A and B are shown apart, each in its own frame.
Chain A
Amino acid sequence: NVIQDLYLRELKDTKLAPSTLQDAEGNVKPWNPPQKPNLPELELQGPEALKAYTEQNVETAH
């Protein structure tokens, strides 16, 4: 009765208002890239280090 009236009115006479996906973007965190592979670069290459180390600390094992 009143149920029917409400049902009728609600469904028919107004529905969803406008709302854009674009506007949504502002309110969410957007995807961004995982920049950089982050290559490590070789350290201590060559016997330059070795000659340095042999000479530098001469402290013997006790």
Chain B
Amino acid sequence: VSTLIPPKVVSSKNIGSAPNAKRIANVVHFYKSLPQGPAPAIKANTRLARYKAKYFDGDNASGKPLWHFALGIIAFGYSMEYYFH
């Protein structure tokens, strides 16, 4: 009797394995990926984006904006001492 037709019916091996699910994710995801990002934000020259550029970089954990920002509040109230005295 003639061989049956199972080997040639493939359309439930298109969901049949788990990486089909992953495939339909990364055919979208990686295809819509850019070569490099859009932009990281670091500066924009609003003149305080420069503050971010010098101090608040991705790799700058350096305490300098803190010191500067602290010193700003010291400059503020010290003048206000002379506003009240």
Main secondary structure of the interface of A (DSSP, over half): loop
A61 CA to B13 CA in the complex, in Å?
Answer: 8
A-B contact count (CB 8 A): 26
Q: Are B9 and A60 in contact (CB under 8 A)?
A: yes
Number of interface residues of B (CB under 8 A): 11
A52 → chain B, closest Cβ, in Å?
Answer: 9
Which of A43, A50, A53, A58 has a CB less than 8 Å from the CB of B12?
Answer: A58
B5–A58 touching, CB < 8 Å:
no
Closest 3 CB pairs of A and B: A60-B13, A53-B5, A57-B6
- Which residues of B approach A to under 8 Å, CB–CB? 1-2, 4-7, 9-10, 12-13, 16
